[PDB]
Ligand SMILES: Nc1ncnc2c1ncn2[C@@H]1O[C@H](COP(=O)(O)OP(=O)(O)O)[C@@H](O)[C@H]1O
Ligand code: VO4
């Protein structure tokens with residue numbers, strides 16, 4: 186039952202839009218929204234909602250794909266589905282992350298180009314699940330034709346890293362507290378040859394700090410599950426998380442997580458990856474030592490002195506150092522006086538902070554060590570020629586309390602959104618001019634340069650923070666003052682905080698919303714200083730793992746006569762964006778449907794907010810107004826000559842002699858441009874004549 190003008194979409198105050206002209210019933214649950222006759226905000230919203238209602242969580246929208254978290258297991262990821270999707274062109278199968286992986290694989294061998302699968306989304310949208318599903322597809326496909334084979338190690342690298350780098354947050358039960366770029370290397374002929382992982386900025390603060398509604402890293406609770414009681418024995422620890430201050434400040438148990446089963450999965454991954462018992466037990470020992478380290482009490486003799494060595498002893502053993510030397514490093518750290526040393530004094534406040542810093546440094550360096558070890562086994566020294574990189578960053582997040590870590594996370598999300606903007610809206614139209622195509626530049630209003638420049642550019646939030654660290658008499662309020670004196674009333678995206686709920690220092694108009702930031706401790710977080718007397722002990726440690734985590738350590742440079750976290754983050758992020766530009770990108774935009782992890786429920790305003798700040802509608806219009814398929818006149822002649830037997834003057838006669846809408850294609854300098862769908866008709870016609 187449908188009428189052309191009686192069925193119309195009308196705006197709403199509670200559900201965004203309620204049942205602009207509606208699309209005919211033939212376009213219900215359409216696999217590509219660039220084929221809809223009417224393209225408007227509720228037409229896209231309702232098609233996604235209609236497909237989502239039938240557990241169709243993927244939908245193409247122009248050249249990229251959208252995906253809505255089902256919050257339930259669906260039978261769409263089986264090896265039957267994997268093997269079936271192999272070879273299938275995008276239009277010859279329903280929308281899926283498997284179809285993106287296979288088509289990126291096809292472009293890689295066809296164009297002899299490296300590919301990238303860039304997966305966007307808010308915290309909990311589904312980036313990590315979709316990333317693991319890309320890796321799954323490639324490994325399952327390569328497998329067709331103790332420590333396991335390359336394909337199994339590739340698969341098991343993610344549960345092993347998730348134990349130490351994932352944690353429960355208010356928005357996600359398995360939140361990635363670090364970004365990763367996985368490169369899957371292929372030979373000249375297309376065989377899977379090798380893989381590597383590059384991790385970016387692990388949330389160190391989480392090791393020793395938790396907000397009310399969140400857990401520390403999964404690993405702590407997995408060990409405390411007691412499913413491996415030999416671990417509790419080895420680590421000299423109890424089975425109660427509330428006995429360790431570093432790990433029990435917020436939540437301790439997650440309903441969706443069986444910590445006991447996960448401990449087995451984690452251990453099994455280290456096994457398949459080729460980790461020795463000395464390696465595994467060493468990592469467990471350090472995790473255990475970090476728990477003990479947090480329980481070390483101190484007191485005044487201002488000067489701190491140990492208040493009971495019981496926990497200090499347990500940590501010193503798992504680490505392999507003298508307990509008394511560890512306590513004297515913490516309390517009286519050495520100061521270099523040429524070839525001699527003088528102890529500095531530390532009050533209880535200072536020793537406590539120093540202990541926390543060393544615990545976060547050990548944990549972070551253990552994660553970086555583990556990644557290196559995974560890479561060393563994934564390095565097969567087999568012939569490689571190309572790669573398909575997959576980017577799984579920490580998603581856009583807004584907590585009841587936003588600190589430096591959230592700015593680093595949300596900044597990366599802004600950067601990745603700008604990458605989408607530049608590629609889809611700037612580079613695409615620039616190609617229409619390059620190929621001599623008739624094209625009026627369309628301003629789609631997709632440019633976050635204002636917010637990006639506010640954070641990364643000189644005299645921006647991060648540049649201000651970087652200089653301020655290099656001042657010994659600089660306080661949190663001098664940093665806030667410099668931030669305000671430079672940006673309030675000058676930077677449109679920098680505003681006064683819009684505040685019972687934790688006090689905020691400033692506001693930031695991010696692409697996905699206004700985030701209230703609190704600048705307390707940003708100066709100390711960016712500097713990241715360590716008690717080098719203890720790190721020196723770490724270098725001499727009798728536990729090979731602890732000695733190697735700190736062997737590369739470069740201390741505070743020697744003084745002469747007469748590097749920050751944010752600086753390294755921008756440096757990494759810029760190196761990432763410049764390298765991604767040399768690849769063919771495939772965008773997968775993940776949409777979190779509702780706040781309460783409810784399977785099948787779709788919050789129309791939350792969905793519409795995402796589709797808007799992502800630029801889904803804008804990205805659909807450019808595909809509809811332009812010519813998404815482009816073929817070189819030589820390659821076109823090679824393949825479609827069969828339809829009706831100079832490369833351009835041949836393609837001109839051939840296309841005019843065929844029975845097609847002659848307005849659906851335009852001629853470029855070196856390529857013939859086709860509109861949406863027309864390429865499929867020519868391939869269908871070639872299939873009719875090849876039989
Ligand atoms: N495609 C999917 N199918 C089923 N459940 C999913 C899917 N994507 C995400 N989920 C659910 O959402 C949770 C968080 O998704 P995740 O991929 O970790 O999000 P992100 O990486 O964007 O933070 C998962 O633990 C799972 O319960
Ligand atoms: O929850 V996330 O993995 O998006 O950080």
Ligand SMILES: [Mg+2]
Pocket residue numbers: 312313314359360361577578579580
């Ligand atoms: Mg994730």
